[PDB]
Automatic annotation (TrEMBL), chains A, B:
The lineage of its organism: Bacteria, Pseudomonadati, Pseudomonadota, Betaproteobacteria, Burkholderiales. Pfam families: Rubrerythrin. This is Rubrerythrin. Mn(2+) 1 binds at residues 19, 52, 55, 123. GO terms for molecular function: metal ion binding; oxidoreductase activity. Fe(3+) 1 binds at residues 19, 52, 55, 123. InterPro entries: Ferritin-like, Ferritin-like_diiron, Ferritin-like_SF, Rbr2/Nigerythrin, Rr_diiron-bd_dom. Fe(3+) 2 binds at residues 52, 89, 123, 126.
Amino acid sequence: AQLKGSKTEENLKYAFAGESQANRRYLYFASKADVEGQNDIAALFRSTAEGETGHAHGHLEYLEAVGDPATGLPFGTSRQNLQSAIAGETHEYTDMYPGMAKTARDEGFEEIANWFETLAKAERSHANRYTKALDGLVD
Amino acid sequence: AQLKGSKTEENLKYAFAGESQANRRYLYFASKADVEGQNDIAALFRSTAEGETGHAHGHLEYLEAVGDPATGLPFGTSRQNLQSAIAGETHEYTDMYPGMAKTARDEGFEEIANWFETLAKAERSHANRYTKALDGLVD
Ligand SMILES: [Fe+3]
Ligand SMILES: [Fe+3]
Ligand SMILES: [Fe+3]
Ligand SMILES: [Fe+3]
């Protein structure tokens, strides 16, 4: 049984995306509870969120055998990880966010379009900072 | 312009999924850098990860207008957030992870099948604990 090409590979990718989003959603919910004064519920969202971190990183460990789910590229060492991050960030600022910005403007969501443009610029900053770190990597 | 049904809705959901995964991936990479001794790189993966948290939560905020990407339910208040988390967790432990476990076992990935079964049990625990919290909520 080779993981590359299997249904189990696409399920690990899907579950990794879901666990990742669950951690994000639960911390967002924790902050809503914070403001409401629901400190016990905020603590519970935070603790559950740690569980989803453990789940997501377990999925990622299995996916080391087949590649980074965001890029298809090898990950593992810091050199590989920086390489995969630069490629993903480059996709985000040259393709994904500008194209989402265009569609938002075309559909009449001007503020959301400016938000996608703000994020394209941020991901370009991320990309260039990771590239600088890769240039300085001594491994 | 109505966000519900637009291409911009689907793009917010996709970008939220992407930003969520980026934070998880970058923290994973930070831990790899930790063990290698690449502390400057680890610090950069963590700082960048904070940016991806900010991005994902900005996407979620726009999605308040159409519903939780995991469930379709409204979100915002702790009462709503708990109900959505419960519905999502219930799908995970009754349908998603048991189904992935079966596919993995059938494909020859016994360890991954057991992992999916561990996670089914874990999400059931989360679902029940959130339900307890929802019954205790005073708002
Ligand atoms: Fe989980
Ligand atoms: Fe980024
Ligand atoms: Fe980002
Ligand atoms: Fe959970």
